[PDB]
Amino acid sequence: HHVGTFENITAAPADPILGLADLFRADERPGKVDLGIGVYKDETGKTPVMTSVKKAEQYLLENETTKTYLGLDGLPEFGRCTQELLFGKGSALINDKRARTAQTPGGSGALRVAADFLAKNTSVKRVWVSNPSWPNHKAIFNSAGLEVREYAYYDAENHTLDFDALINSLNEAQAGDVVLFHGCCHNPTGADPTLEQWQTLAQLSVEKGWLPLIDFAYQGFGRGLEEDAEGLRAFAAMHKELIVASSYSKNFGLYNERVGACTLVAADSETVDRAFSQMKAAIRANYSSPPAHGASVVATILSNDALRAIWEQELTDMRQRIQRLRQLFVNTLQEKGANRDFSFIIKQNGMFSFSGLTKEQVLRLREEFGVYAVASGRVNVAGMTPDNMAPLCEAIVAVL
Amino acid sequence: GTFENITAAPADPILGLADLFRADERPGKVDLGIGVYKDETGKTPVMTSVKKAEQYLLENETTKTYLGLDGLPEFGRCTQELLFGKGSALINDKRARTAQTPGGSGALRVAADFLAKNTSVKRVWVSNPSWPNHKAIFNSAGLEVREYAYYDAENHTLDFDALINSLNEAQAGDVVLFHGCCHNPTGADPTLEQWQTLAQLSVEKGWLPLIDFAYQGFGRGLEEDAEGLRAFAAMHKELIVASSYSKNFGLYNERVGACTLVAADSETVDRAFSQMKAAIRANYSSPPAHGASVVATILSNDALRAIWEQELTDMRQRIQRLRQLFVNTLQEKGANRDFSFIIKQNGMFSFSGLTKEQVLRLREEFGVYAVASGRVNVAGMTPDNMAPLCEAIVAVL
């Protein structure tokens, strides 16, 4: 007799998200509202395929002649388009060939590739992430054997990015550590550094010698494509080295196609080429080449003036809707008699903010009113509509 | 600088040979070093069934919202039917769980990370000759890779005696990796009787079989190619299967594969699979939908499935015909030795039996390109290039 290889495995803990989705599905109240969602939804409650994406897919279907493998870094045009979004057309960084980009399976894949590349090829032992954290960061970096530490970031009770605390906590970050920043639309708080703050952080990273990693999954959801990249570009202007993990899941609505990129920046082209050769090795040890369809869609859109214009308008419409809903949420809370100020909501960027509700209040909201947020109090503003706003605000006022 | 001292990775010999071939100005050049299927016209087309499925999806799809870590459920069900057989006791007993993954490559990395983090597995045994990417994948997860004896190069045979003797060193708790059919690069596969012997040995010694199954349908047919896998599954222990649909659906760049865990019972495999999902969450999270949706659409539609099965049959039969033509033509051109082994081998790949010096001469002198190891891809052969190709081979013997 031999013990089974799987015999001693203890089950992973049940995912609370899926469980809460369960209760929500079973709720027979016609007025139930789900603010716990992690994707964009439109005014009708759907997560549609963008029209620009449908048009690109039709083109690909008619024109693709082979699905033979591409290289470990994926589609070259996709890489070029990615670097232009990150750094700007005509960027000196691009002119000097200081950046190399690998297409990856989502921003998640890009983070994993970065982690594996760092663990195998550098002396990095530690990655610093914000509090509150995006939970998947720890799992990804830990899997590569990297310790994850948190820096101070959001002051929840005052609904403020506590920049002094951020700077102070980072004094503990040593030269050679990685510090991860969300490039725009911080998830889950929506609280972003101002440009002046980004410039301060960029200067600090040079002085202290840590490697910035920019997680950039919401370009276009904040203030605009160029605006949302201003922080990233401040780092790029000051630093010899940088890593960017990009996602097109949200801004192209391509979630399930797994479209992202890992971009390395080094002091010069010789150095970035050497480093990138080892990034390719990390990819070869993982999934090898990245999935073509979603990247082909992105390249098809970005490289075509007409399709690009359609896509930019679609993204603008999403961004403006979120901005309008943030204002509407605040107005409606005031109108329904909220006992306190929610102005911070207008100061925050992207789909997510902390409502400021306690765990007990979130529970009461679900039980008593059928309004579902996550335990942390995070809400997704895209789940709000003119149709459900007054009911959800009356419910919130009731639990305060 | 964090990157200043990084040492450049070695040159990829594959890309380097492809560069050489591309620059070769000789019109009679022949590329047998390719790693994908090519048709009679030298193309790797999209299968007709796949184009049709893609059109269905474009019409039908209403969202690209995330799926779960294991991907598309119907894809997993279709996968298990291909692996184990529809209506099989194994499926009825809910003994298997499948995660859709980015290619067979991704399935292998997911399996490796799962094993390293959740089991006492320290070592993975692979065949000599090896498929080069296995070592990098398993080493990346912290697992040692050891080689077992497999192919007798001089006699062009699977050396089963050496194989069995090699594996006596495999310890309870180790993983032993087998190619399910169409061994790459040799095309030399165990007979059913040999698979059964290997399955019995795994139970006796307590090692975990991992079946790399990337060529189902390229050997003798779908069911036939799964017989070896099913012989292991019949043992009622534990198994892992890393599937690929890259080759048999021509979906290479879409990254469509699966990692399937099997255990003695449903409760056990459920516990294991929960931790496999954790390994996926720490990697790329959910898998790429497009290629898996294509596979599921084809396999669950009578009209499309028939089109696909005929296409795959046509490819399999073309390869078989070319193997025979190759052997016949070598004999006619006066080869000084027997190449009958080529007919006894399955799939696109065989070792030609040429030495490294001979391979070099073949490329330099005659513009015929094989892999340095002497591996050739039969699908690169055609009725038109066959005579010149064989004349060149005879010339370097």
Curated annotation (Swiss-Prot), chain A:
Family note: Belongs to the class-I pyridoxal-phosphate-dependent aminotransferase family.
What class does this enzyme belong to in the EC scheme? transferase
PROSITE patterns in the record, alphabetically? AA_TRANSFER_CLASS_1
Q: Which Pfam families match?
A: Aminotran_1_2
Q: What is this protein called?
A: Aspartate aminotransferase
GO molecular function terms here?
Answer: identical protein binding; L-aspartate:2-oxoglutarate aminotransferase activity; L-tyrosine-2-oxoglutarate transaminase activity; protein homodimerization activity; pyridoxal phosphate binding
> What does the entry give for GO biological process?
L-phenylalanine biosynthetic process; L-phenylalanine biosynthetic process from chorismate via phenylpyruvate
Q: Which cofactor does it need?
A: pyridoxal 5'-phosphate
- Describe the applications of the protein: Has been used to construct a 2,4,6-trinitrotoluene (TNT) biosensor strain.
Known outcome of mutating residue 378 to A? Reduces first-order rate constant about 10000-fold
Where along this sequence does the record place binding of L-aspartate? 38, 134, 187, 378
Q: What keywords is this UniProt entry annotated with?
A: Aminotransferase, Cytoplasm, Pyridoxal phosphate, Transferase
EC number, UniProt record: 2.6.1.1
Q: What induces it?
A: Transcription is increased specifically in response to 2,4,6-trinitrotoluene (TNT) and its indicator compounds 1,3-DNB, 2,4-DNT, and 2,6-DNT.
Q: How does it assemble?
A: Homodimer.
Curated annotation (Swiss-Prot), chain B:
CDD domains from the entry? AAT_like
- Impact reported for residue 66 to F/S: Slight changes in activity
What induces or represses its expression, per the UniProt entry?
Transcription is increased specifically in response to 2,4,6-trinitrotoluene (TNT) and its indicator compounds 1,3-DNB, 2,4-DNT, and 2,6-DNT.
Result of mutating residue 134 to A?
Answer: Slight increase in maximum velocity of the overall transamination reaction between aspartate and 2-oxoglutarate
Chain positions with N6-(pyridoxal phosphate)lysine modification? 247
Record's PROSITE patterns? Answer: AA_TRANSFER_CLASS_1 (PS00105)
User: Does Cytoplasm count among this protein's keywords?
Assistant: yes
User: Any idea of its EC number?
Assistant: 2.6.1.1
Catalysed reaction per UniProt?
Answer: L-aspartate + 2-oxoglutarate = oxaloacetate + L-glutamate
List the GO cellular component terms. cytoplasm; cytosol
Enumerate the Gene3D superfamilies for this protein.
Aspartate Aminotransferase, domain 1, Type I PLP-dependent aspartate aminotransferase-like (Major domain)
Oligomer and partners: Homodimer.
**Protein's UniProt name:** Aspartate aminotransferase
Q: Which organism is it from?
A: Escherichia coli (strain K12)
Q: What gene does this protein come from?
A: aspC
